[PDB]
Amino acid sequence: MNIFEMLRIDEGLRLKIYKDTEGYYTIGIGHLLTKSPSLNAAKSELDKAIGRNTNGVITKDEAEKLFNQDVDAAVRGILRNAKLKPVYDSLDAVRRAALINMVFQMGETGVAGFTNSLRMAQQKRWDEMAVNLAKSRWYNQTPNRAKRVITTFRTGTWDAYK
Numbered sequence: 001m002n003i004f005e006m007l008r009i010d011e012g013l014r015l016k017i018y019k020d021t022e023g024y025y026t027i028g029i030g031h032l033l034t035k036s037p038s039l040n041a042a043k044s045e046l047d048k049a050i051g052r053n054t055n056g057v058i059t060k061d062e063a064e065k066l067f068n069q070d071v072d073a074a075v076r077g078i079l080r081n082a083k084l085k086p087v088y089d090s091l092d093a094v095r096r097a098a099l100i101n102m103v104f105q106m107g108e109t110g111v112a113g114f115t116n117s118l119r120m121a122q123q124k125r126w127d128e129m130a131v132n133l134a135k136s137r138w139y140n141q142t143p144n145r146a147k148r149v150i151t152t153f154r155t156g157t158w159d160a161y162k
């Protein structure tokens with residue numbers, strides 16, 4: 001298992017514009033297009049992202065290209081963040097994947113806000129961290145995905161995804 005396979009399982013793959021769990025226009029492998037309520041605005045963002053007049057539909061290859069860029073962007077956002085970087089540096093490879101996953105879904109800002117859980121991760125207090133991560137809107141809104149991510153973060157294994 002790896003970050004890509006992990007996220008592909010959590011986000012799924014859709015080739016036509018759809019609405020995510022929060023109601024936002026998305027496409028491909030969890031690629032958020034816009035928070036705006038307008039389909040047209042979403043269509044324009046899509047075209048801009050792909051570089052062609054899309055008609056709201058993309059190909060599998062296009063979906064994977066956006067996904068690569070998005071994963072790269074997530075890692076880079078962690079390394080550029082003063083709060084996240086140190087955490088990431090302190091973890092093993094499986095746990096690092098869990099932090100990338102969270103940033104991918106909620107953004108750097110969102111994640112940087114889990115102040116207390118981050119401090120526990122840094123201290124390697126796994127169970128305490130896992131309880132703390134669960135006390136969140138994140139957990140309450142998308143519990144199954146959160147459980148999978150939290151288990152990974154906590155145990156350092158891929159058992160939640162096998």
Ligand SMILES: [Cl-]
Nearest residue numbers: 048049066069
């Ligand atoms: Cl983009």
Ligand SMILES: [Cl-]
Nearest residue numbers: 142143144145
């Ligand atoms: Cl869920």
